[PDB]
UniProtKB/Swiss-Prot annotation, chain B:
Induction: Induced in the hours following cyclic mechanical strain in keratinocytes. This is Desmocollin-2. Expressed at intercalated disks in the heart, where it is colocalized with CDH2 (at protein level). Expressed in intestinal mucosal cells (at protein level). It is found in: Cell membrane; Cell junction, Desmosome. The chain holds residues 300 to 353 of 901 of the full protein. It comes from Homo sapiens.
């Protein structure tokens, strides 16, 4: 209803790097009258993963 | 007319996929254009049958 765009849970720079997501608009009667918006979205890194003896 | 939901395929395996999502709406005015409309989700949990032998 307002196009505010959020994430649901915490990610890890450990596990992931970046993400490509499409935004799009649709009418209530089931049709798509305009072009979609590709989004680009990066995970950011801190030292937060510990050192560990081998 | 009744909101009873069914399957259309036998392409189900709990040994691979154990949940679905499905998106659904109800609408008045027998579905016409100025029929007002309200949207929900449902989840479909797959249960197990014995199709792997030991």
């Amino acid at each position: 209803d307002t196009g505010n765009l959020y994430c649901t849970r915490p990610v890890d720079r450990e596990q992931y790097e970046s993400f490509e997501i499409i935004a799009f608009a649709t009418t209530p009667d089931g049709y798509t009258p305009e072009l979609p918006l590709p989004l680009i979205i990066k995970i950011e890194d801190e030292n937060d993963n510990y050192p560990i003896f081998t | 007319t009744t909101g009873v939901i069914t399957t259309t395929s036998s392409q189900l395996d709990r040994e691979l996929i154990d949940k679905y999502q499905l998106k659904i709406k109800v609408q008045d005015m027998d579905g016409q254009y100025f029929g007002l409309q309200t949207t929900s989700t449902c989840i479909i949990n797959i249960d197990d049958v014995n199709d792997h032998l030991p």
